């Protein structure tokens, strides 16, 4: 009974492997001009936290920031002039996620408490109060993204993903597919959905449908993922000191962003406008700026005194915000 | 050069800074201790004796506030959420000491202690070892299957010699003999002075940390 099932599964595996397999992007990108050297200098230094910050998100206006650290504090920032717009106390000090709603009305936070809390910013009486406290996950939440003003997607360590409804805290959709899910990236059109797990794999789901659409395999656990601005590709960063780029329409791997001088994993991954600079926040006390279309590194963003945790890029590509295990958040331009 | 709007929006930031400054110094007077023992070894019987995810307990003793974090039923990869506990004053490891008769999960406890003690994040964090459940172990000496599980080993039937041998075995599992320090208490079912031992241990480790930071060590 088990032998027949194993043979059948192996038949499918080798069939899809042979079907998904001459040219290479790294070879076809020859005889082209590289970007050169990027040496952007820090423009803003942000203080106030006394802990290791873990997550952040740029606002939709490219001027407001949200920051969460290992202390029970959530800070709304002002990147233009350094002013603390508002501070919010968290019930749970262990938080790993951040989210800024596109409307700017709500923020989200979650951590080891297995629940995600929504805070409302623009309210009467000049206060920020909890709007919803969604629960139903057995584990630690890894990422949260606002699909819309009323829909949110959460990935936790229970090897499943959830699509919720703010109006009614009941779960709307559950995605099952192992290893702990560590990162989440939302489609630019908010139509698709991707999640990378600890089993050295990533999965692309269908938000409307509710079932997995595609799978990608590389090795070690994956803890960073982000969509390309086009929406037909994404970038992943694993703990094996290797960064990779995958294409939805190809179901293959293009090139590896690795160097023999680094044996350190990747903590955060992000892109810029037009998808030309891929910024990878490593755990070797500094970030790196790879060329997403080239196999050669371009620039290094040093200046942090500890492991870089979070990393964000504005919607218009005007500044890059980096955070690390030291409580200073830096804005680079 | 600031406008009337901007001038009034700087005092807001100053008030926020003052609030975080006064709030941030209240979290530096509390000592963090991490429970990491086995679930059925007696953790539930020791948290209440002193008086979903992570459980936080707040105690007071000798005008000192203790925060105790229990990761009871996370059931996730320990390598992905153990970073948050870097900098914890001490790790309280607890064992049942009477689970060698399963023949084994005693080797599982030994492996777990080896993994936690030799962790890269806890290279300078003290470990307090609690050997519990003495009543059953002492009352099973009549037909203790210690020779059955270890046919090649020979020893006395007295429980004190076995306790000394097993404490030595747990101590020898340590690989960093210069930074870390394992403390054993011999906790019992009906003990009352468990808090005093942990208070003395944290006082000793904080004095040693102050001496190291000052420059003498």
């Amino acid at each position: 009974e088990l032998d027949q099932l194993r043979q059948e599964a192996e038949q499918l595996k080798n069939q899809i492997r042979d079907a998904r397999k001459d040219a290479t992007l790294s070879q076809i990108t020859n005889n082209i001009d590289p970007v050169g050297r990027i040496q952007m200098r820090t423009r803003r230094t942000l203080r106030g936290h006394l802990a290791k910050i873990y997550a952040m998100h740029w606002g939709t206006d490219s001027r407001l920031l949200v920051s969460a650290s290992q202390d029970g504090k959530l800070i709304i920032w002002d990147s233009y002039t350094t002013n603390k717009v508002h501070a919010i106390p968290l019930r749970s000090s262990w938080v790993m996620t951040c989210a800024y709603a596109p409307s700017g009305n709500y923020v989200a936070c979650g951590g080891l408490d297995n629940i995600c809390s929504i805070y409302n910013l623009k309210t009467r009486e000049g206060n920020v109060r909890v709007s919803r406290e969604l629960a139903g996950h057995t584990g630690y939440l890894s990422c949260c993204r606002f699909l819309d003003d009323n829909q949110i997607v959460t990935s936790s360590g229970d090897t499943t993903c959830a699509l919720w409804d703010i109006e009614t805290g009941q779960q709307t959709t559950t995605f099952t597919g192992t290893g702990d899910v560590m990162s989440l990236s939302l489609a630019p059109d908010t139509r698709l959905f991707v999640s990378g797990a600890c089993d050295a794999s990533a999965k692309l789901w269908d938000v409307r449908e509710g079932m997995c659409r595609q799978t990608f395999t590389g090795e070690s656990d994956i803890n960073a993922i982000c969509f390309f601005p086009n929406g037909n590709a994404f970038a992943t960063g694993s703990d094996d000191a290797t960064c990779r780029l995958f294409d939805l329409r190809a179901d293959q791997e293009l090139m590896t962003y690795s160097h023999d001088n680094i044996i350190c994993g990747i903590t955060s991954v992000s892109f810029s406008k037009s998808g030309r600079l891929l910024l990878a926040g490593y755990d070797d006390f500094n970030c790196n700026v790879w060329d997403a279309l080239k196999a050669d590194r371009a620039g290094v963003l040093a200046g942090h005194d500890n492991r870089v945790s979070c990393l964000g890029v504005t919607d218009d590509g005007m500044a890059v915000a980096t955070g690390s295990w030291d409580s200073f958040l830096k804005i680079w331009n | 050069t600031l406008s009337a709007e901007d001038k009034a929006a700087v005092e807001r930031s100053k008030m926020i800074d003052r609030n975080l400054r006064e709030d941030g110094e209240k979290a530096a007077r509390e000592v963090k201790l991490l429970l990491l023992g086995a679930g059925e070894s007696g953790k539930s019987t020791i948290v209440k004796q002193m008086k979903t995810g992570i459980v936080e307990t707040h105690f007071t003793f000798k005008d000192l506030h203790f925060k105790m974090f229990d990761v009871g039923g996370q059931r996730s990869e320990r390598k992905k959420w153990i970073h948050c506990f870097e900098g914890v004053t001490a790790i309280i490891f607890c064992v049942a000491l009477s689970d060698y008769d399963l023949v084994n999960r005693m080797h599982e406890s030994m492996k777990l202690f080896d993994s936690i003690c030799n962790n890269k994040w806890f290279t300078d964090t003290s470990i307090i070892l609690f050997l519990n459940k003495k009543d059953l172990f002492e009352e099973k000496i009549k037909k203790s299957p210690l020779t059955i599980c270890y046919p090649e080993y020979a020893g006395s039937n007295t429980y004190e010699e076995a306790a000394a041998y097993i404490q030595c075995q747990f101590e020898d599992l340590n690989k960093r003999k210069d930074t870390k320090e394992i403390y054993t208490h011999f906790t019992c079912a009906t003990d009352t002075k468990n808090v005093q031992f942990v208070f003395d241990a944290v006082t000793d480790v904080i004095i040693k940390n102050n001496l190291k930071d000052c420059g003498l060590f």
Partner: single-chain antibody
């Protein structure tokens, strides 16, 4: 949700009294709170302003050293102490509040209290004066800035308080639905999509950039 001003002013000349105000359901500890008066025929102008934390006690140029403001955040009470009463105190006092993020100041206005006695000036002129409202059409309000209200930050100061016949004014633009505002340099235009019986009232225009927000200059467009 509620801001009640108390203290009825009717005393013999030569005395002093207090005018208090209390707020319900507000974060009074994080709100700046101005004080304004309305004459029988005039606009709205500052008489006092206090910021959060009590670090800014700006007063008015008309009266100085006689009026003072005291605040109690735990008691949620703000009151005015007045000394050396003069004949020019026959106004309705209001206790508007505001807050400044890095966002809509002068939002809520109080009911106000009476102040009566028992028995170098900026001026603006417009080509149109007291234009009656023609039924079946829509009215538009034009305004020009004497100085350059636009700041280097691009934050043009443009307030359009509307006072219906009643108790307290309201906000139209802080920097309804039918009310709209079009700005071009020194020219400002308020537009109303449709008229209604509740749309009739008095409008006031902006002439302030510096510390004293004296925007009391404004034509009475009741008819």
């Amino acid at each position: 949700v509620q801001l009640v001003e108390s203290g009825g002013g009717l005393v013999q000349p030569g005395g002093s009294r207090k005018l208090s105000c209390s707020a319900s359901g507000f974060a009074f500890s994080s709100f700046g709170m101005h004080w304004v008066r309305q004459a029988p025929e005039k606009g709205l102008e500052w008489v006092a302003y206090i910021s959060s934390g009590s670090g800014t006690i700006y007063y008015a140029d008309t009266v100085k050293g006689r009026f003072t403001i005291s605040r109690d955040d735990p008691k949620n009470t703000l009151f005015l102490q007045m000394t050396s009463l003069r004949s020019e105190d026959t106004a309705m006092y209001y206790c508007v509040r505001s807050i400044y993020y890095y966002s809509s100041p002068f939002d809520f206005w109080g009911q106000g209290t009476t102040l009566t006695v028992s028995s170098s000036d900026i001026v603006m002129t417009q080509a149109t004066s007291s234009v009656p409202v023609t039924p079946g059409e829509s009215v538009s309000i034009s305004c020009r800035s004497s100085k350059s209200l636009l700041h280097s930050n691009g934050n043009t100061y443009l307030y359009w308080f509307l006072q219906r016949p009643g108790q307290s004014p309201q906000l139209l633009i802080y920097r309804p639905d039918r009310f709209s505002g079009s700005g071009s340099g020194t020219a400002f235009t308020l537009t109303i999509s449709r008229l209604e019986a509740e749309d009739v009232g008095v409008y006031y225009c902006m002439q302030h950039l510096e510390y004293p927000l004296t925007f009391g200059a404004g034509t009475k467009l009741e008819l």
